[PDB]
């Protein structure tokens, strides 16, 4: 062991020291994976957990979400204008064609710096107000347009302001840019969560799911209103059955978030819930339909006594979502402790 | 068109059968078997705090990189067990790592759908991310450097890709796999490569052309592992159906099947010896198996891991085998 081998060994020892420090930091992290379906609420649950922290207007969280809302507003013009080419709809004023390139010319500059320039604001105002695009927006059924485009387009002036402060209603409707994996660190009441959202994962679960073998719990977001909104709740039931009864998540408790409960309250008044579930045979009011939907999700749960489902009707107004996750994770930790101590 | 495709499949199957004179067992039935490989753990590389998903040996046969779910990419001196570097990843969900043949770079990727290239030899003393290879819409299951500027990555989006690391662009996209592509093996001359996918197919690709030269389908389940034979005329696959297979590029066949009845776990990683006589396959049953690549019998077992052997690789000099596993340890065997 020469002098340089000694200094290489000392370097390896410092590396081990940092590795242990990092592992001790990460061991205190509680890893949860958000695992709801396509339009379920995972993104809005993570966003709502960030925002409503300590007051409904924790604005410092709202500051990081300005680029996303800008991108949604910016893409909204790009989506509506590009819809004209597929719909073969001509602009009422041909001068929009020059402005049509103008948005794409500034599209790169706006998304990269996370701001809406005044020139784009005029370009956006003119393009959106053009009747030809207005018909194009009305024909959104055949075009890939996010439902948040309508509200932002009606308030592009608020979005482009220099001191624009995103609002909770503005953020909660934004669509997080599709990213393979999404990690969110939450510290709630001395407990640090890492909500690991696997975003657009264009691959099979059976290959990447064991990467989350040792998560504390799974947060499964379900859209309650989606029972009649291509078999959205049937997709949630299939996904939940697969995830709950996964070989990797035998002892991993599931936090079941049932999202958009008020929207369900309107939809059942209009649409009967028997459409999704032909064998419902129950009342079509809320606090009956909701409990029914929980019952299906928690009845898909096989292999009880090892894992538990913590069902919650998510309230975007209050911190009952993060509080429920804290309570469920606390119960998960305490139950695990009871288990190896042998009491339960 | 579907009838024509099935007719062409039948034609390829008959053409393959026309070239199957004698099985590889019958031809190799007379060679003296290797006795029993007593590889022993010469080094245990400790320092990873989560499951190890990938390792790659350096071409100097002394350094190896490993990727773990603990978010670290560690470079080891396997002779001294010294940790040369510990690279913290932006995404801890890393499934693959590659070590550049120059040694100037490592790659890693996984659930972030990005191959990150790391500059090992920077003027500052740190390893930094030199390139983020975005463009895959699924996770990266494997990555392999062609040289300092080129790297082939397989993905769960069912496509392999050739990248220009300088520009960061997919120089070639290798489409044709229907299931998740789980592995790559560059040919020794790196003019072509094989990829195994979850559609139980192994596809021989042309790097320069960009086209699928051959498709190899003998497995019953997902192919997790693939490895070229040292002469580049054959490759071995390791699948979830608890079997390995040796395919020949020129015969376009499945020469040999490396299976045991009491082996029911899938294969996570396969590799060959320097002479290629040994196919060392890592298994879910916690222990790697040494196979006689020519006679299809287990020469030995590299038991010694407390969890699934997730990755393995034989040095370029053939001296040692490193097995990483989900028990967070790398063990050098010999």
């Amino acid at each position, epitope marked *: 062991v020469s002098a340089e081998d000694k200094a290489a060994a000392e370097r390896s020892k410092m590396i081990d020291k940092n590795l242990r420090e990092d592992g001790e930091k990460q061991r205190r992290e509680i890893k949860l994976l958000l695992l709801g379906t396509s339009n379920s609420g995972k993104n809005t649950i993570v966003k709502q957990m960030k925002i409503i922290h300590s007051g409904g207007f924790n604005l410092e969280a709202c500051k990081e979400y300005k680029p996303l809302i800008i991108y949604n507003a910016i893409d909204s013009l790009t989506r509506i204008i590009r819809a004209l080419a597929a719909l073969r709809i001509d602009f009422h004023n041909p001068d929009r064609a020059y402005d049509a390139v103008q948005l794409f010319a500034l599209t790169g500059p706006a998304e990269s710096k996370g701001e809406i320039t005044p020139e784009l604001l005029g370009v956006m105002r003119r393009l959106w107000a053009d009747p030809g695009a207005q018909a194009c927006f009305s024909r959104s059924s055949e075009y890939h347009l996010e439902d948040n485009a309508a509200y932002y387009l009606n308030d592009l002036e608020r979005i482009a302001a220099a001191d624009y402060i995103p609002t909770v209603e503005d953020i909660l409707r934004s669509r997080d840019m599709t990213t393979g994996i999404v990690e969110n660190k939450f510290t709630f009441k001395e407990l640090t969560f890492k909500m690991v959202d696997v975003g657009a994962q264009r691959s099979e679960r059976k290959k990447w799911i064991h990467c989350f073998e040792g998560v504390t719990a799974i947060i499964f977001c379900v859209e309650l209103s989606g029972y009649d909104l291509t078999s959205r709740m049937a997709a949630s039931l299939k996904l939940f059955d697969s995830i709950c009864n996964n070989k990797w998540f035998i002892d991993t408790s599931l936090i079941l978030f049932l999202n958009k409960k008020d929207l369900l309250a309107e939809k059942i008044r209009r649409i009967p819930l028997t459409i999704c579930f032909p064998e419902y045979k129950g009342q079509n009011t809320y606090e009956e339909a909701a409990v029914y939907i929980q019952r299906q999700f928690e009845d898909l749960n096989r292999n009880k006594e090892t894992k538990e489902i913590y069902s919650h009707f998510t309230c975007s107004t209050d911190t009952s979502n993060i509080q429920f996750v804290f309570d469920a994770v606390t119960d998960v930790i305490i139950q695990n402790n009871l288990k190896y101590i042998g009491l339960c | 068109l579907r009838q024509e495709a099935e007719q062409l499949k039948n034609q390829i199957r008959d053409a393959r059968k026309a070239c199957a004179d004698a099985t590889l067992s019958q031809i190799t039935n007379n060679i003296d078997p290797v006795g029993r490989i007593q590889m022993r753990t010469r080094r245990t590389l400790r320092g990873h705090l989560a499951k190890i998903y990938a390792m790659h040996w350096g071409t100097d046969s*002394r350094l190896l990189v490993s990727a773990s779910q603990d978010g670290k990419l560690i470079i080891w001196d396997s002779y001294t067990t010294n940790k040369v570097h510990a690279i913290p990843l932006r995404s801890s969900w890393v499934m693959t790592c590659a070590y550049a043949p120059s040694g100037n770079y490592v790659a890693c990727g996984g659930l972030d759908n990005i191959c990150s290239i790391y500059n090992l030899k920077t003027r*500052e003393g740190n390893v930094r991310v030199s390139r983020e290879l975005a463009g895959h819409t699924g996770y990266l299951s494997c990555c392999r450097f062609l040289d300092d500027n080129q790297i082939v990555t397989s993905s769960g989006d069912t496509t392999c890709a050739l990248w220009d690391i300088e520009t960061g662009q997919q120089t070639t996209t290798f489409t044709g796999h229907t299931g998740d592509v789980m592995s790559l093996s560059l040919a020794p001359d790196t003019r072509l490569f094989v990829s195994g996918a979850c559609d139980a197919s192994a596809k021989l690709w042309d790097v320069r052309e960009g086209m699928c030269r051959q498709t190899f389908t003998g497995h019953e389940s997902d192919i997790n592992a693939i490895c070229f034979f040292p002469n580049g005329n054959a490759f071995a696959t390791g699948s979830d159906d608890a079997t390995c297979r040796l395919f020949d590029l020129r015969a376009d066949q499945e020469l040999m099947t490396y299976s045991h009845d009491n082996i029911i776990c899938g294969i996570t990683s396969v590799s060959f010896s320097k002479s290629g006589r040994l196919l060392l396959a890592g298994y879910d049953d916690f222990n790697c198996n040494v196979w006689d690549a020519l006679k299809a019998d287990r020469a030995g077992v590299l038991a010694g891991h407390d969890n699934r052997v997730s990755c393995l690789g034989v040095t370029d000099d053939g001296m040692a085998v490193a097995t990483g596993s989900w028990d967070s340890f790398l063990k050098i065997w010999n």
Partner: single-chain antibody, 232 residues
Framework: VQLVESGGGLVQPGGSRKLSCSASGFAFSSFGMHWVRQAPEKGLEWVAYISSGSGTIYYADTVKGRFTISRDDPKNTLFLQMTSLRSEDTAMYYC??????????????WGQGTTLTVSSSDIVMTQATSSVPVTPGESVSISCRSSKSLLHSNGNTYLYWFLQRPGQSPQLLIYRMSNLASGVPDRFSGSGSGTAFTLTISRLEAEDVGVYYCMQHLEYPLTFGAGTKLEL
């Protein structure tokens, strides 16, 4: 990447001063740092070595106890406190970046140095040849001899070659025997075995003029050779 020494100046003998080097543009916390001095007309003489993490410190036996070497990782500053400053402590003190892992390039970057002027078992690396006369475009070979085998049993030969170009800090050329440092033109080449070493410059240019230094890194008294100058 730079190292900038501070301190120096006229010091009354028996006094005390503290040298500082501010590191910039590199991960200073991960580099073992050396102090290497050069008497105002003599060769290089290694002073001290604080490793990365400060866990290991060495001194030249000529200055042990009188100097202490310290680093400020948050400040990226390397220090040398100097006490009982004799007359033989006059030198130009170079801080040397130095990182040790497999295949690393120790002694690869050197600071500008600060001249310090004071009022009035070690491996002997011998390069007895000095002031080799040579002309541009002509191959030259500088010898170096070692009082011990620099060949370690691990396969390394811890011989270093530096280039003190006139008015310039040493430039690492060959880090371990026959290893060309990055940025060194691929005409320099190191050779040797055991104790005898040769630095062959394939086709030298006007930049190669200067003084070429041996250095063993087999042990920690780090000893140089009396540099063999090249002169046009």
């Amino acid at each position: 990447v730079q190292l900038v020494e501070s301190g120096g100046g006229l010091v009354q003998p028996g006094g005390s001063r503290k040298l500082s080097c501010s590191a910039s543009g590199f991960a200073f916390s991960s580099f073992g740092m050396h102090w290497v001095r050069q008497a105002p007309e003599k060769g290089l003489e290694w002073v001290a070595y604080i490793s990365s993490g400060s866990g290991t410190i060495y001194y030249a036996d000529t200055v042990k106890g009188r100097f202490t070497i310290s680093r400020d990782d948050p400040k990226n500053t390397l220090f040398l406190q100097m006490t009982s400053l004799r007359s033989e402590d006059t030198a130009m003190y170079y801080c040397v970046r130095s990182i040790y892992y497999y295949g690393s390039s120790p002694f690869d970057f050197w600071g500008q140095g600060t001249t310090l002027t004071v009022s009035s078992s070690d491996i002997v690396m011998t390069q007895a040849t000095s002031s080799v006369p040579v002309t541009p475009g002509e191959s030259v070979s500088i010898s170096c001899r070692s009082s011990k085998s620099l060949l370690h049993s691990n396969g390394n030969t811890y011989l270093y070659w530096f280039l003190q170009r006139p008015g310039q800090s040493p430039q690492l050329l060959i880090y371990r025997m026959s290893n060309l440092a990055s940025g060194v033109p691929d005409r320099f080449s190191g050779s040797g075995s055991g104790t005898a070493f040769t630095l062959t410059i394939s086709r030298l240019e006007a930049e190669d003029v200067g003084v070429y230094y041996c250095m063993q890194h087999l042990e920690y008294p780090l000893t140089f050779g009396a540099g063999t100058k090249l002169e046009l």
